[PDB]
Scaffold this active site. Structure first.
Site, short mmCIF file in Angstrom:
data_model
loop_
_atom_site.label_atom_id
_atom_site.label_comp_id
_atom_site.label_asym_id
_atom_site.label_seq_id
_atom_site.Cartn_x
_atom_site.Cartn_y
_atom_site.Cartn_z
N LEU A 1 33.74 38.47 39.94
CA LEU A 1 34.20 37.45 40.76
C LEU A 1 35.37 36.93 40.31
CD1 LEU A 1 31.29 35.91 42.91
CD2 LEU A 1 33.25 37.12 43.55
N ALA A 2 35.20 36.29 38.79
CA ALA A 2 36.42 35.75 38.10
C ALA A 2 36.64 36.41 36.86
CB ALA A 2 35.93 34.32 37.88
N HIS A 3 37.64 36.06 36.17
CA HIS A 3 37.95 36.40 34.70
C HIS A 3 36.98 35.76 33.83
CE1 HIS A 3 41.10 39.03 33.85
NE2 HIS A 3 41.62 38.68 34.97
N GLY A 4 36.19 36.46 32.97
CA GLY A 4 35.71 35.70 31.73
C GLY A 4 36.02 36.53 30.50
N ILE A 5 34.95 36.25 29.49
CA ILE A 5 35.01 36.88 28.10
C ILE A 5 35.08 38.37 28.29
CG2 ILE A 5 34.22 36.95 25.82
CD1 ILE A 5 32.73 34.58 28.48
N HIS A 6 34.16 38.86 29.18
CA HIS A 6 33.84 40.22 29.37
C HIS A 6 35.27 41.12 29.80
CE1 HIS A 6 30.10 38.99 28.48
NE2 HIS A 6 29.92 38.29 29.45
N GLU B 1 22.70 51.70 32.17
CA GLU B 1 23.38 52.94 32.12
C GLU B 1 23.81 53.53 33.31
OE1 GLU B 1 22.27 56.09 28.86
OE2 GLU B 1 22.70 54.30 27.52
N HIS C 1 29.02 43.92 35.08
CA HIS C 1 28.48 43.17 34.23
C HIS C 1 27.28 43.94 33.51
CE1 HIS C 1 26.80 40.25 31.54
NE2 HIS C 1 27.18 39.13 32.10
#
Lengths: 121, 121
Positions: free
Chosen positions: A70-75, A45, A9
Site C-alpha cells: 500500500l505505502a512505501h516502507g523499509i522493505h 516461497e 511482504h
C-alpha cells in the site's frame, strides 16, 4: 523479453501468498505479458530472487518488479533495492536490467473498494 | 449514527500514515457517512482506540471499521478485532455496536491498479 514480477511482504499466515497467487492468475487471463512470476519477501516461497531468476531463465531481458504494498516502507526502500543488487550494501543477476516500480498508493480504486467493504459487499 | 473508521498498519517512516490521511480525505469527499476517522495500529498517531473513541463522542452508534490492508494477516484477524473489543483480551457502551469489514483482498480493481503500476503509471 520483458517479465512482470509481482512482489509482496509475505506472512506466516497463508493469506498473503494466496493474495499474490490470485492476482497472478487474474492478470494471466488478461493476456498482457510473456511471463508473470510472484515473489514474497519474507518466510514464504517463492522469494523475490527466485522469481527474478525464474524470469531470466524463461528468456526475459527487461524485468518489471512491481511492489504489491500500500505505502512505501523499509522493505520498499532498503530490503528490496538491496535484494536486486540496486543498492550496494546471496544474489546478483547476470547481464539483464531490473526495473523497479512504485507501490499502490492512495488510488481512487482503493477508495472504491473501501466503500464496498464498508457496506458488507 | 453510523461511523466509518479507516484503520492502517503504520510505520516509523511517515508514508504509511500519510497514505491513511489521503484515503480518509478522499472518502470524506464522496459524502457517504456521518463520521469518518482514521487510526494507525503501530508507532504513529492517531491510534485505533483514539479513532473509535473519537467517533463515539461525536455521536456515533454503529461503527463500521474497514481494515485498509491487502490480505488477511495477523493484524486483520487478531490485532484489530482485539483493539475493537471484538475478541476477549475497549469499554464501549452497549448502546453502540462495532461492525468489522473485510480487507481489500484480491479484488479485480487491484489487478487493474497493478497493471497501471507495471507501466510506470
Amino acid at each position: 523479453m520483458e517479465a512482470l514480477v509481482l512482489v509482496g511482504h509475505g506472512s506466516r499466515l497463508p493469506y498473503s501468498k494466496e493474495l499474490l497467487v490470485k492476482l497472478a492468475e487474474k492478470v494471466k487471463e488478461r493476456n498482457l505479458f510473456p511471463i508473470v512470476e510472484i515473489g514474497l519477501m519474507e518466510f514464504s516461497e517463492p522469494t523475490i530472487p527466485q522469481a527474478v531468476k525464474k524470469a531470466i531463465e524463461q528468456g526475459a531481458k527487461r524485468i518489471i518488479v512491481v511492489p504489491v504494498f500500500l505505502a512505501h516502507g523499509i522493505h520498499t526502500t532498503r530490503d528490496i533495492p538491496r535484494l536486486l543488487g540496486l543498492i550496494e550494501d546471496l544474489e546478483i543477476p547476470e547481464d539483464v536490467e531490473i526495473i523497479y516500480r512504485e507501490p499502490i498508493g492512495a488510488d481512487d480504486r482503493i477508495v472504491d473498494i473501501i466503500i464496498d467493504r464498508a457496506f458488507g459487499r
